[PDB]
Amino acid sequence: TNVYADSFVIRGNEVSQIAPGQTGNIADYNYKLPDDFTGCVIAWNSNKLD
């Protein structure tokens, strides 16, 4: 029905914080996911670009 794409770059090791029920600097202050999240998470290395 409604699909939205979010884009952001983290320091790499914080990918575990982008998940429902997680805590941390990114999860609690920048980007929080709800416990009822229904979607997909896509993350890849960008050391050559950013």
């Binding site: 998940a19 429902p20 029920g21 997680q22 416990d35």
Partner: protein
Amino acid sequence: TPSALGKLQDVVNHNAQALNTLVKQLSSKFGAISSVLNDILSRLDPPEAE
């Protein structure tokens, strides 16, 4: 002879025993890591705690 009313005594004994064995079931670990819900929520993440 105090054993004359054993029929009526077994009625209140079976009900008391059924309630006592029901409380002890709360201490059981039905395949979980603990029998306390507060401990599971504090130790594991919401994705795994479910």
